[PDB]
Amino acid sequence: DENRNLVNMQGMQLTGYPATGTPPTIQQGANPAPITIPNTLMAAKSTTTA
Amino acid sequence: SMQINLNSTDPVPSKTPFSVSDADSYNKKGTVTVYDSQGNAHDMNVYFVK
């Protein structure tokens, strides 16, 4: 789409489970929301084990 | 009325004080929709914790 959702060929959005967190995980304990591929940036992770 | 199949091998959760937002306190979340006397829809979340 313009807003970069997922949508079938008639203009209806495909709902699903959103993703929050650092690192993001799935939250089945949430409301069903429209999925959106984001234009954002990945975030860096500081080193812990070498 | 609500039927549910719960897993017997599922562990007792680690984060012991119960809350709503953090998704490692409960084991299972389910949702029923009811209707009040004027017809407004309300959403009851049941949370099952071992």
Note the maximum CA span of chain B.
Answer: 43
Residues B11/B50, Cβ–Cβ less than 8 Å: yes
> At what resolution in Å was this solved?
2.9
Method by which the coordinates were obtained: cryo-EM
**What are the DSSP calls for chain B, one per residue?**
-------TTPPPPS--S--SSSTTS-SEEEEEEEE-TTS-EEEEEEEE--
Contacts of A27 in chain B (CB under 8 A): 23
CA distances from B5 to A37, B36, B48 (A): 34, 28, 11
SS3 assignment, position B31 = strand
Which residue in B29, B33, B44, B45 has the most chain A C-beta atoms within 10 A of its own C-beta, making it the best mutation to test that interface? B29
Q: Do A28 and B26 touch (CB under 8 A)?
A: no
A20 touches chain B (CB under 8 A): no
CA–CA distance, B15 with B26 (Å, rounded to integer): 9
Place of tokens 């993703």: A19
